[PDB]
Amino acid sequence: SGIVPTLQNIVATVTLGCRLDLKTVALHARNAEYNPKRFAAVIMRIREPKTTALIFASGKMVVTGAKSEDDSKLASRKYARIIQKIGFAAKFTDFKIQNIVGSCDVKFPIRLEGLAFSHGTFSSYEPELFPGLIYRMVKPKIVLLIFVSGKIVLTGAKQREEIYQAFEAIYPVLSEFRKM
C-alpha cells in the first residue's frame, strides 16, 4: 500500500545504576510527583521531547510517550541528567525500547464480524464489550485493533519495521472485508 502507519508512542527502559532516594528526587526536580501510597516511584515529565518517566528507588527507569526512537533516547538521557544533577551517581546504561505503538487509516469502513469469523484463531470481537476487533498477528508478532471506521491501531513492536510489516500483511484482509 501507499499508507504508512504513524508512530504514536514508544516505551523504553533505562538502568541508572545506583539506588535513589525518591523523596529527595521529588523535592529537587520540577514537575515531579512522589506519592508512595499510590505507586512506588517518582513520576516526572519534561516538555521536550514530550514524555513521562517512572523513576524507581532501584535506579531503574521507564520513559513513555515518545514518538520516535531518537526522541525516546534523548528524553531518557535528559531524565538521567536531571537525576545526576540532583547528586546521584546515575549513569545511562542498557537503554532499550520495549514497545512501539502505531496507527493509521485505510479510509473505508470494515465488516468486522465477517473478518472475525474468517480469521477466528487470530480474532476477538465482542462489540458490546469493546467496539474494536482485537487481531493477534503471528508474523510479525503484533496486536492490531481494527475498527469499523477503517482506523487501525498496531502495538507490541520492538522495532518500527514490525509495525510497518504488520500493516502490510493486514491491508489485503481489510480490503477483502470492506463495507458496501
Binding site: L27, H28, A29, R30, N31, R45, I46, R47, I82, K85, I86
Partner: protein, 50 residues
Amino acid sequence: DYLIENLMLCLYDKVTRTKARWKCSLKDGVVTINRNDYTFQKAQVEAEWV
C-alpha cells in the same frame, strides 16, 4: 528549568489531569495577587502544562 510574590495558600480536595490539562478543586484559602489579598471558600484551577 528542571531543578528547584503572588502566593495562594489553601487545601486541595482534588487534582486531576488529562493529557496536559490540569484541574484542581481547592478550598479554605488566602491569596495575595498584585498586592491585594483575597480569602476564599472554594477555588477551581484550570491550567495547561505546555
